[PDB]
Design a binder for this molecule. Structure first.
Ligand SMILES: O=C(OCCN1CCOCC1)C1(c2ccccc2)CCCCC1
Ligand SMILES: O=C(OCCN1CCOCC1)C1(c2ccccc2)CCCCC1
Ligand SMILES: O=C(OCCN1CCOCC1)C1(c2ccccc2)CCCCC1
Ligand SMILES: CCCCCCCCO[C@@H]1O[C@H](CO)[C@@H](O)[C@H](O)[C@H]1O
Lengths: 214, 213, 216
């Protein structure tokens, strides 16, 4: 079977190409930067911290964060839980957003080709890692790392808000982000809002690349 | 120009339906159901259920199913799980008793209909779109899930309420069945839901025929 | 006559259902619900991990060759009916399965509706059951046993740290649709789907190899 071996080798070479590109790529942010910025302001009210974190992010990384007139809270229904996001930055390999919920929810965390860090500004974050029978609760200031290829169970109490950074192959999350919209909530207006904010963030990153070149 | 023509055609359809819903006669109204439920909100929710059903059959004869056509049917939707007892249902109205004996919550749905819920017992947490804070509602209060808006709903164990919906009722069907098709696989409950809805529609049609002749 | 074709389909499905029902009524089983319930309640006073170990030991002694070995035991996430838990499969055939189930988070949802009877004996935590057609639920504690009967559908809810021993008997294939739906249409965690298929393949092959060893 020459063609099946060619398919195996070709899919392997595509994976190898993306993996080597992700290892040798320059990034705008890093998980430690976002985590420390969020932990520094985790002692305030989460709204005050939201404002301060957005201001600091726009100061240190101009042209990589959406403006105030492009920021809106969009519901996120995924993995059986329901939260809300405010997207600040998004490329093909990075994204920064404000995430959280005003209700008690929980479910599957997803399993993607990306590493996702969450630093709690308020509330509680229960993580139940795969292969164990016990979970751990995290509090404001802490940082949870949803590692690459790993799947956990997440649970948040009412009023839990955090700053989120994802790095890796971001498209590998879209299916997880849309399943509950297609097969449960049927809230396609929220789907439109999500597509709109992510289109805006991608266009911002493209315009910044063009502005850097000229 | 073809796309503008498509937009205009759907707009003319929307205005025709919207003007029909605004100038249509209705059997109930959301304020009537809300006041009736709040009047009995101080008693036990089951006893209040009985009194509310009797009062509705008195004020609106021929528009409410009889006792042998009332049954509790599970409702799995938007990630939450409750139960309903349908009392009335047409193409533009429905009245039911809703609630849950477990702690659940999820997406409220987004339809072309206005849905009001008056709590008989328990707690009702509503989280409106675009905000970072939610609110808890108690027996006697009424939540209005307005047309086109989406919220997050959450109910504690033992939460029961009286619900009235007005608008384009078919626009909710998909939501009410999604979790049954793609999660629970409880097609017997799907049959129960289709059955109770068919009974309510047939009651409304036969009542219209009897009033006309 | 099209009515003849519809009656032929109905009658054929009826004879198939009767054939499976009669096979299930005259079949020999490895376990029974009372055995698993009493064994779990006997160790329900200990920590759930210690009870897990003791229950597995007793089960492997009383039914050798029908339970997977230690290197074939792994915790696999179970997303179904809107809830999320975890399983450790010990035994599984086409008509029986024994596993350890539970959750370390607060979850709940639809219990499912299959052609099988499923029993759960609580080792720790709380188990809230809401039966169909009623407006009240009941909470059950370690030592109690919940029976998810054939054809019934309930709402289940578990508090964080709730663990139990589960036995199912009936037509096990009738559960696959429920057991995988949330993975296909929500979590997209196909690696967990692979883990589930792997452990079930191991249990089925163990039962087949045990029958072959008994025959020769
Ligand atoms: O909005 C999000 O983030 C929620 C994640 N939460 C919950 C689980 O734990 C980490 C934080 C996600 C997203 C939203 C929109 C587009 C693409 C992705 C990103 C990661 C998880 C899926 C949804
Ligand atoms: O069964 C219901 O009622 C839930 C009400 N809950 C949940 C949604 O938000 C308000 C409270 C609904 C229904 C079921 C079946 C047919 C037509 C409608 C009515 C609208 C809301 C979802 C589905
Ligand atoms: O993992 C399980 O068993 C815990 C079930 N629970 C929870 C609800 O109440 C009864 C016990 C099930 C399974 C998982 C995977 C394959 C085949 C079956 C068995 C039937 C019910 C859920 C899915
Ligand atoms: C619906 C089930 C409610 C369980 C008890 C909640 C007690 C109050 O809980 C509070 O409710 C507020 C309003 O949503 C939230 O803003 C707070 O974050 C939450 O702590």
């Amino acid at each position: 079977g020459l063609r099946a071996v060619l398919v195996v080798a070709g899919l392997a070479v595509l994976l190898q190409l993306i993996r080597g590109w992700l290892s040798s790529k320059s990034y705008v942010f890093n998980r430690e930067e976002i985590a420390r910025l969020a932990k520094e302001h985790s002692g305030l009210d989460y709204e005050v911290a939201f404002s301060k974190i957005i201001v600091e992010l726009r100061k240190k990384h101009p042209g990589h964060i959406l403006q105030d007139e492009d920021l809106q809270w969009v519901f996120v229904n995924a993995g059986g839980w329901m939260g809300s996001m405010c997207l600040l930055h998004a490329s093909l390999t990075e994204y920064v957003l404000l995430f959280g919920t005003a209700v008690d929810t929980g479910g599957h965390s997803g399993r993607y080709w990306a590493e996702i860090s969450d630093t709690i500004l308020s509330g509680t974050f229960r993580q139940w890692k795969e292969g164990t029978t016990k979970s751990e609760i995290f509090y404001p200031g802490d940082t949870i790392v949803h590692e690459v290829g790993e799947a956990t169970s997440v649970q948040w109490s009412s009023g839990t808000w955090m700053v989120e950074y994802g790095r890796g192959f971001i498209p590998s999350t879209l299916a997880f982000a849309l399943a509950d919209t297609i097969f449960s909530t049927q809230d396609f207006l929220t789907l439109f809002y999500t597509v709109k904010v992510y289109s805006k963030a991608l266009l911002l990153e493209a315009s910044t690349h063009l502005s850097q070149l000229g």
